[PDB]
Design a protein around this nucleic acid. Structure first.
Ligand code: MG
Ligand code: MG
Ligand code: MG
Ligand code: MG
Ligand code: MG
Ligand code: MG
Length: 81
RNA sequence: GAGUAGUUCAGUGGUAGAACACCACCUUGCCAAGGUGGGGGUCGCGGGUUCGAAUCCCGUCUCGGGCGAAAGCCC
RNA sequence: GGGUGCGAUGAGAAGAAGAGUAUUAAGGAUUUACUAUGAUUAGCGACUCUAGGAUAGUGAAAGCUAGAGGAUAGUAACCUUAAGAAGGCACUUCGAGCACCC
């Protein structure tokens, strides 16, 4: 769902920043890219589900980057609405 | 002429030097830098000369080049 | 503006380390190791001693190997005092630029 990502009010970018966004429950929707290494994805989606927050996985992470406006690509993006 | 420490170069008859690299400690999450120490070389290989050969001689191996009809020879 | 490289699998900055460590002095201790050097005189060549080596010549004493032990300095290693730094990854906040080139 890049409609939700390329828009939205507040969005944090990067697995660490999404984990820090989860660590204070200020995030409303969590987006995670599929073709990323699951070793890192696991830790953020687990904490996400544990918090009880919705997770919307997306196909491409380069596309995630492009939707965020970033030029390098992201693994996880948190929408801190 | 080219072949010498792991690499790169010195060493022009006295058992192989420097630099860098490597190991150990300093030392620690981890490396770099650094400071002490340390280990390492059929000197292409084999005979001879000599008390002693990386050095001289002979045979021989590989590479680059020169001479020669070639064998050889020279660098 | 152009050509690359890296970058949310974290650019970059600060912090935290590194650390009271390196380094700089004054003493202290005077045992360790390392380095340099060893009168005259022959000899290319000498810190001394033992054991093998090998040994032509020179010398009171030879070059190798293995030990052990020495003076003269120069160093590091250990205490006390006063000062006292430094790069990167990783870590911790901020989170997107940084680097080489013309
Ligand atoms: Mg011819
Ligand atoms: Mg021929
Ligand atoms: Mg950084
Ligand atoms: Mg820093
Ligand atoms: Mg401290
Ligand atoms: Mg120009």
């Amino acid at each position: 769902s890049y409609d939700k990502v390329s828009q939205a009010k507040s969005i944090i970018i990067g697995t660490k920043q999404t984990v820090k966004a989860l660590k204070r429950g200020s995030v409303k929707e969590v987006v995670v890219a599929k073709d990323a290494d699951p070793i890192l994805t696991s830790s953020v989606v687990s904490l996400a589900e544990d918090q009880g927050i919705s997770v919307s996985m997306v196909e491409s992470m380069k596309k995630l980057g492009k939707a965020c406006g970033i030029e390098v690509g992201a693994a996880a993006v948190a929408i801190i609405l």
